[PDB]
């Protein structure tokens, strides 16, 4: 011990497994906190004891940097992802295509579309950008079930509280209880990218060892298993 | 709706604002895709649904034309630009002069120079031509941080991943987080020029209306605001 990592909710499973393997191999305890990248960046700005931050978008890393909270010499883009629509496996929902013709109203059946809160959650921000580009936003905005992070959105679908949800490709890979039923075209939104950086003043030898591990082959194997792409 | 525009990454902000104003005034949706002009030209060759193409160089328009993908009767040079070196505003980098005496090695501090990939990105091609003419290319080529388009190069500097980058003058105008620290002499490279053309078979009345709008005073004011010169 002891390293404290703040990581985007979509990284929950990968980062837990990486922490477990790092403990086994290096004997260092890694304690992780998972929430929306917005929530995490704001906590770091306000003074949280995080050593490392991984965001699900460039936006919230840029925010933390602008607040002079990050060791910028350590910043780099670590992972990529896709944006998808999921439905429960028990659902009868057939696979559909996402484009400007998509009939969201018909697909929703009077139900709501689970999303990360588009006011701040990266998954919601990516979703809103895509839906605006596709001309679907005004139709969908009153039909949303916003959640506090992308895993809250995933949970609404897992729990059948919303028939469809917008989450990351990796979220479907991690979930026994939902399946991808549509994938957003990559040209419909900003590339989903995960920057990592050490928090300003926290780059000691132990933190550096874990940072390096995140860029190594053991971690890469785990990230790929969970549906992330390696930058 | 609906017009599809493929435009050089350097046109991102200008073309977004032009699309917004055109929608307001004409009620037509303009959907834009931004990437390196190389990437866009090759997508059009392979069969993309683009109606209009604006390249950041003559080279990639000539390429698209050679592949018989363009309505050549509509081709013309729309804009000009400059080539610059940017640094973050938080950098202590002083302004310098670009000529054959420039000490790039000293300026870089062991860091890398962000550029559009000089194998295909127009900003990289212009950069390589200038650096070769100035006698700096052999020194700099192993010190580059290539990016997939000029906005990727700009992002490396904005994010402090590279201390300096070669981008267009317009890119500095669009970016809160970098400033120009040197300007390439105009005689060091081919004039930065942006040709526009309608894609072969796509010149319907709606596309023609937007094409004409790009040559009008409303668009010209936006292009100038973003640092472009009007041809």
Curated annotation (Swiss-Prot), chains A, B:
Annotated binding of molybdate, by residue: 10, 37, 123, 150, 168
SUPFAM superfamilies reported in the protein's UniProt record: Periplasmic binding protein-like II
GO annotations of cellular component type: ATP-binding cassette (ABC) transporter complex, substrate-binding subunit-containing; membrane; outer membrane-bounded periplasmic space
Biotechnology: May be useful in radiopharmaceutical applications as an engineered disulfide bond-containing protein with increased affinity for perrhenate. May be used to remove chromate, which is toxic to many biological systems, from environmental aqueous solutions.
Organism (species): Escherichia coli (strain K12)
Induction: Expression is up-regulated by molybdate limitation. Repressed by molybdate-bound ModE.
TM ranges: none
One of the GO biological process terms: molybdate ion transport
Keyword Lipid biosynthesis carried by entry: no
Domain of life: Bacteria
Protein name: Molybdate-binding protein ModA
Record's keyword annotation contains Transport: yes
Subunit structure: The complex is composed of two ATP-binding proteins (ModC), two transmembrane proteins (ModB) and a solute-binding protein (ModA).
Coiled-coil regions, chain positions: none
């Amino acid at each position: 011990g002891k390293i404290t990592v703040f990581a985007a909710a979509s990284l929950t499973n990968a980062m837990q497994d990486i922490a477990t393997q790092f403990k086994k191999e290096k004997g260092v305890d890694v304690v992780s906190s998972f929430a929306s990248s917005s929530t995490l960046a704001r906590q770091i700005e306000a003074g949280a004891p995080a050593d490392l931050f991984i965001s699900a978008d460039q936006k919230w890393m840029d925010y933390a940097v602008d607040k002079k909270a990050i060791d910028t010499a350590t910043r780099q883009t670590l992972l990529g992802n896709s944006l998808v629509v999921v439905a429960p496996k028990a659902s009868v929902q057939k696979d559909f295509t996402i484009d400007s013709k998509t009939n969201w109203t018909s697909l929703l059946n009077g139900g709501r579309l689970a999303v990360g809160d588009p006011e701040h959650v990266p998954a919601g921000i990516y979703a809103k950008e895509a839906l605006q580009k596709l001309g679907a936003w005004d139709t969908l905005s009153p039909k949303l079930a916003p959640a506090e992070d992308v895993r809250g959105a995933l949970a609404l679908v897992e729990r059948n509280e919303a028939p469809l949800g917008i989450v990351y490709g990796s979220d479907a890979v991690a979930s026994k209880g939902v399946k991808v039923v549509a994938t957003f075209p990559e040209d419909s939104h900003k590339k989903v990218e995960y920057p990592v950086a050490v928090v300003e003043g926290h780059n000691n030898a132990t933190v550096k060892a874990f940072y390096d591990y995140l860029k190594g082959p053991q971690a890469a194997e785990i990230f790929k298993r969970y549906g992330f792409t390696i930058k």
